[model samples]
Target: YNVFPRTLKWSKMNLTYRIVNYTPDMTHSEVEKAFKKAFKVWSDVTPLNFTRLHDGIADIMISFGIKEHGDFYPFDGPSGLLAHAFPPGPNYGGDAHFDDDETWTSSSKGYNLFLVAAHEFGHSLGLDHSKDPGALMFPIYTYTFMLPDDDVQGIQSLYGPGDE
Candidate 1:
């Protein structure tokens, strides 16, 4: 299912992402910070730069909710659409969603939002899922503090090997 890849071809851009419904388990700022770190895992390898907006307005916004919030692919509370994103497009197109019922936790037990968000961002950038288990765009979800090399290659292919 080769969906699409990130089209952030520009030398640099202000890509923003925010967390909705701030939770005690994970603060909005913390979530934002973790995402920045996650995003850096990619930007560090490539020449591309990312500018995170603190005003809560960004190119890509992260949201949390259950059921049909707003999208052709609706959330199934806890199952199915664990999370989904749109291909590069207009406003709200690059947004990402998480199943509130899934219990998003940063700890060893909960779903890894960083990993999933990274994967979803792949979609938001116009990249599709990869069959390779090593790929970050893999269908199944795995918890980890960092992204694997497989995903890096996939992204590099899409954006043209960084320092190009």
Candidate 2:
């Protein structure tokens, strides 16, 4: 496929986020670390920066749930529909939700939270699904440390290249 453009992205270079809750599949520290790294995936490639908050509202609110959470789109169990997130906006916008019914792991055995979080954060930052199979923004999931070139180009188009 090809890279699709999103009309709504963060207007500034820096943004704040918070982990409102955690999934039982992983430890608090693991979740914290994984999310940091996931955010770095995009941050490393773009001018965007993310800061984690301990309390209060943030641009991105992250949590885990099963079936129907608070959103209109409920998550499917197990392998189908791993997670979802809102595009950039006010209030509930830029929030991310993971399906608790799926086995979340840092390793490859289960759905890697870091990988999914990275992808979800892409949406949170206003990136749409990429037609490029190698892209992290692709509709499907694939675990990799290397960010696809398509994703790099796409994000850079919005936030520009990061300082190496």
Candidate 3:
């Protein structure tokens, strides 16, 4: 159970994303920057490229919502869940939703949105939770600039290391 396998993944390397709304936990600019950085963590190590869209549908749609916002898996409020994302596909696929009830933050004060987003994006990319405790895909959260080696290898197994 070191690395979980995924049956679905984006066939294309380039993907587009749209931030449908901003979280009040942090400034809009901060949220934008953190998301970009979080995405870069995966992009930097893979051939994948992400573009932000101001309007129209995108491969990845991001937003914040409380319990029973719109989807079937409603938020549990506050600390129970940090966020969740759908696997790649049409309709609800690749959509990432964050729990607005949580005190999200850019720093270590609260649940770090970037870190959790990165983990969720991993799920969006078709990677399942890793058994390794140090991995980004681990069930538990741990903030760090460096992604664990297992995650890098796991991603590379799916998408070869980008220009490494």
Candidate 4:
């Protein structure tokens, strides 16, 4: 069985991230755009803001990999564990890793990087899988816009509402 939402959260509102590597399935611009849009899903509903860092330390580090990566959580290939992310913390965490074994794409051809990345970011932001099938934070993968109603409530409850 999978897990549920955890209470761990970021102490600060603004966060920084860096992509240590990219998935071969997508172009650099595509990958960057996907993540940027994904982050915006949560940011739009919460006071949290995300910035990309070209160098130095950041709140989150992103990469693509398959089974037997450096981390303890080895990704499952194909339709299995698509991606994983860490929660906010002072130690070396808050990272997002994607399963390179899967076919990532910009369109509906394969798994949409935007959608998968958006889901993974919920975990990075310390949100657990929701039982709400209509929620973006649902454990199962499904086509949905950035933030569904339940997801908006979830992130807003954590970080409060964002600015207009």
Candidate 5:
């Protein structure tokens, strides 16, 4: 049950973001769907809401980039780092970055976009790695549409349960 040391957390419920760029590995619609589903994972169980911005500086600026794409944290050729994100807040906060070098897939063939994005979205929402083995927040990799119980509990603690 640990988060970023800076206590990087969002005080707002409604959040906005935009995928500043895309990867050539997947089609635009496929990539969009991946993120749409990924975002639902968090919004489903918490009051926090997410909206996509078409042409504005959103709270989050998501992008798929290769090595040294402006940010200090550069992506390795492949494997070492799948994706990255900042904890909730302003500016860099809540932004997610994907290593374009990785073969992002729509399914389990390579790396599932939904799973990776879902996990990263958790970090953007202020969740850190989970000690529990099966949690989505767990450092290890795996895929499941269902959110683990531990993940639900942690998210609820941060932003409270979803509105019925």
Candidate 6:
């Protein structure tokens, strides 16, 4: 496949996220830790920052389910469609959903929550999948996890290069 620019570039618009009552595979704390680590990956690369909220609705809400989990888009079973998120918008617009049917894990087992979460976050920030297969915004999922510089540039283009 043509997976170029697998990375998600940095941007301004400080992104704060929260993990709801989700992730049947792991505890809420474990899920939150995994998500923090995933966001850290992007923060380490750019000035963009992500915060976790203790109360109130978070900018990015992570959840898992099959159909109608409070978004226009629904989840497909097992494969093909792993998860999806809305484009940037008002409250709940940047929300993200994962298919609970698939085994979510921190390791390379079923679908990696961190990987899918990162990709969905790209969409929540108003990024569409690039033609580049390596992009985190790719339409399909790859067993391997990577975010190339090109993807980073694409994301940065939306929010610009600055601290979130």
* lDDT over C-alpha atoms for residue 12 of model 2: 83
- Candidates sorted on TM-score, descending: 3, 5, 2, 4, 6, 1
Using lDDT as the measure, the top candidate is: 2
Give the least accurate 10-residue stretch of model 4, judged by summed lDDT: 2-11
Which stretches of model 6 miss by more than 4 angstroms? Answer: 1-12
Candidate 2, lDDT over the whole model: 0.89
**Whole-model Cα lDDT of every candidate shown, in order:** 0.68, 0.89, 0.88, 0.86, 0.89, 0.73
User: What tens-digit string does per-residue lDDT give for candidate 1 at 1-90?
Assistant: 885433533223445566555434576766776677767776765555666655566667777777878777677766566788876566
Pairs in clash, predicted candidate 3: none
How high a TM-score does candidate 6 get?
0.81
Would you estimate the TM-scores of all the predictions?
0.79, 0.92, 0.93, 0.91, 0.93, 0.81
Where does the lowest 10-residue lDDT sum fall in candidate 1?
5-14
- Preferred candidate (lDDT higher): 1 or 5: 5
What's model 3's TM-score?
A: 0.93
lDDT for residue 72 in candidate 3, whole number 0-100: 88
Name the lDDT value of residue 155 in candidate 6. 67
lDDT of 2 by residue, 37-110 (tens): 99999999988889999989999999898898898999888879899999988988899999999999999978
Models ranked on lDDT: 2, 5, 3, 4, 6, 1
Residue pair clashes in candidate 5: none
